[PDB]
Amino acid sequence: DVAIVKEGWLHKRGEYIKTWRPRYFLLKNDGTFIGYKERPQDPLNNFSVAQCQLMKTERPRPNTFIIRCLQWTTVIERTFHVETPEEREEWTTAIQTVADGLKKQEEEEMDASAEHTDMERVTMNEFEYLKLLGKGTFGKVILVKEKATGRYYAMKILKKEVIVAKDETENRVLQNSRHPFLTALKYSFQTHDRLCFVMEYANGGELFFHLSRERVFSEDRARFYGAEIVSALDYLHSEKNVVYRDLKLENLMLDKDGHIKITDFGLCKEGTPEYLAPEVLEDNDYGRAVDWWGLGVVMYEMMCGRLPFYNQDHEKLFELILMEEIRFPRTLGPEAKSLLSGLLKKDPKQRLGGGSEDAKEIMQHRFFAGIVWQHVYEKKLSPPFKPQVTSETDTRYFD
């Protein structure tokens, strides 16, 4: 059993919309720090404060505090505000105290759980820089070539100081997910002032630009990609207890054989508004179901050739997402319609995958009948499209 350590009202800055929203927050001794639209009447690692760095600031609002987290390879920040500096002090103190208690118990246990783990490869010059893939608040993602092997990777280069809080996340390659369609970490190293993550880069091209070229995917082809995405998100949800939050078509790549890769290239933005779930827009509470919304948008895009909700004006886009009922092309069939309307329920509690069953609900949906999920996981499904690359070093889809 987990104990509420401290609870109360806080103003929370929106993570996409940047208004201030009063929310009722519980800090628990397992490290969870979670906000609610109302004091709940009765656990995702996304909400953990363990391993955080705590900042006190006075901009844009007085008495604000920032929790900053490295989650896998991405820096995440949550910003809060209270009325009085005395209140801020009690909150930051409770948060620190909970975390310290987590560190102190982890290290005692692992100190005894040590079995010739008491033993004592790569640097920047090993790599050729090729292409900026993204920039963000605290770093950048670049396409590199490993000079010794000719192999291509994405390298994520982050400012060491925003992550580490006077001490110091290097054996992370040992915590790799055992899932084929997630992006695996190959190396992680640090420089004097940077922390670098070298991760796989699929060379079968961007699904965004395969879909653009082809206009639409058949229901069978979208079934294939959807099944692979579902397998990966099921793994994240149930083996890692984390939500992705970032499912969009541009984050989907194909490997040389045609299997999905979900990318891990996100950097801090302190946008793609068309993929945001309604509860994320309203900064209501969110959990595993936000990923099933994204699945719904991505597969609507695959089978219909356009977004379920779009407007060039972001404000009417948000209203469409929040308010408008989904329309389908007339040539779409009823198993696809049922899946998509279920994944795009606006109420996360009514959405397919939004119950205790999580991904099993989707896995059991009519649209996926006949899919052998063990074969999906094992890459025994035969891809409907093989990209035009010779080996894992044919740069067809970059150059």
Next chain:
Amino acid sequence: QVQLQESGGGLVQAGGSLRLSCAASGIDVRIKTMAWYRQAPGKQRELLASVLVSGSTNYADPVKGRFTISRDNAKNTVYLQMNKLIPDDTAVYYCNTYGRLRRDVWGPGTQVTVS
């Protein structure tokens, strides 16, 4: 002052013997896998011996039979007993727990030179 402290070093003649002692101040060696290390003027730091919480011991090849790792829970101290010493054993010796090891935290070490 939470810290690990090594002593017992000095000059020894090859084929000699020495007992190194690691005095823990603010830590409990009972609850922690303890280990011994050494580092020579150009080499990497070397895992030498570890004593599990159970008392199980294990050694790296260059040392088995010759050195013995021992925990003494009553004194909160660990020991390296070094016998049949070799010039290639000359180095600075450290003792550590798992947590301090991965955070690169070290006591002062003790120098052992043999020829």
